[PDB]
Design a protein around this nucleic acid. Sequence first.
DNA 1: ACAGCGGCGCAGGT
DNA 2: TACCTGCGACCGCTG
Length: 508
Amino acid sequence: DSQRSTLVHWFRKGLRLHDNPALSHIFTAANAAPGRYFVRPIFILDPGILDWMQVGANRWRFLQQTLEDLDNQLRKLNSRLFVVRGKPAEVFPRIFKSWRVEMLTFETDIEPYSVTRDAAVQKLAKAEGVRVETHCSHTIYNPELVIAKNLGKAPITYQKFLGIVEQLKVPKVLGVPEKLKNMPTPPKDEVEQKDSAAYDCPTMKQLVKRPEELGPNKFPGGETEALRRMEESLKDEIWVARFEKPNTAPNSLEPSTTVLSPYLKFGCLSARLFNQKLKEIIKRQPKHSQPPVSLIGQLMWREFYYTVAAAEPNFDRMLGNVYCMQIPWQEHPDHLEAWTHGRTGYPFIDAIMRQLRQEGWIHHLARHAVACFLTRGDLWISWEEGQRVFEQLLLDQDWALNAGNWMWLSASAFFHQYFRVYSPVAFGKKTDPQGHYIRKYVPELSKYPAGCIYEPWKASLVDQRAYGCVLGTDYPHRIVKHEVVHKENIKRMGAAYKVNREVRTGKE
DNA sequence: ACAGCGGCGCAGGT
DNA sequence: TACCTGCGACCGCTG
Ligand SMILES: Cc1cc2nc3c(=O)[nH]c(=O)nc-3n(C[C@H](O)[C@H](O)[C@H](O)COP(=O)(O)OP(=O)(O)OC[C@H]3O[C@@H](n4cnc5c(N)ncnc54)[C@H](O)[C@@H]3O)c2cc1C
């Protein structure tokens, strides 16, 4: 085995065995040549970032669980995961030389960090005489090809995007990789000799530095659970078929929606397997919804955002963003901290922000409620700030998706009907009139009648006391007054829209 | 050139 | 039930 070469698959995104052309390529190459190769499936933990703040304790746990599952699955194919600690730049040079790597394969990522990183690793491999074959399986449709077919522009409207995509071929969704035939463990590398457990899966302690920030384990990580959740979600085909996003409740105690997003984000679930499964159901169901409200529609929204983000490195900022509106957002530190910790004084908003911090997922409509309140609805705080918070607390934190959807809610891009402002009091009531959701996440107000649980300021002091929650002590006073402010922000929106319009006129 | 069209709010009705 | 319409006047795309 001294004369063997190594074939390597690099997991960054796409943490699954199913529908992984990059991964499969290896496994099939290996057994095609039974005794000529050593297979290393690797994940590169950049350990320094653990102390980093744009990672929630909850998301760390999700990754930890994901890697363990991925290892277990790999184990069943006579292999294993290798979690290599270090920076790609300082690891790869060592591994190609020490393992004698012949091929490196990975799933392509459009994010700017990933672009610059991959380019660097492409360059390094090119010098070192290492073959690199990359595959595009994070999204159904390659954003590069979508732009191409729209004459080199990324479509900035959903209907237009659908028209472009439908005329593109949908790639074949693969199964799991084959069981490696005749594959002894690769000999320990310099680092493995010194410590055998070096490329083992990280323990919870190793990844979760601040475990007190962990909330209830509602959504376990990994491909196994992803597939399991999906199958259960697809069980009721009628539900699936007649699914319309706006008609789903943000405040229901159990999720109205699938909650497959985190799995789709980490690549524990293949968006192509999902698309494929959905299509099969629509076909068996005459009465069914269509885009953009339908469940396939929602998947196509993910693709939309991925395309537009691919064309713009400044996708996650107002400044230098081609799609984005230039709006004079204002600094309001105290207002920002209050919103971050769900102490706005608005129970519905506070409920949502708390669920987010505690569980790491909140319903899409709920995200709307909070985002609007923060950006154009009331506070007048920049969407970049909200994006920052969400990045920290979301399990399904996605650079393209989070950016794109925050612009939408701030009416900076992709949305423009700024007269439509969500009422932090009115919006919640329609689907949870009793205020059950508020009672759960803001238990301080759990004894309040439905008549003013959304609007505690409407209750007299004698009333508050009697409810066991006196405002200004046991609960925060509302930081702003929605009726006065939102109308005022509406005017500011129109002002900033006009200004952007001149700038456009002037370039011409 | 530019207007008509299609694109997850609220309140107050039937 | 699941519509209707003022609100004040948005955008991108189309012909
Ligand atoms: C301000 C804001 C930030 C968001 N940030 C993220 C994010 O960071 N990562 C993320 O995956 N989604 C994000 N979303 C989109 C959406 O809220 C979630 O994907 C959805 O709530 C997840 O619940 P689900 O997976 O059950 O959705 P379902 O309704 O079950 O939809 C299933 C799939 O649709 C895809 N999808 C649904 N809505 C959207 C959307 N608006 N844009 C793109 N894809 C969508 C989701 O990936 C999900 O995997 C954000 C939305 C908003 C308003």
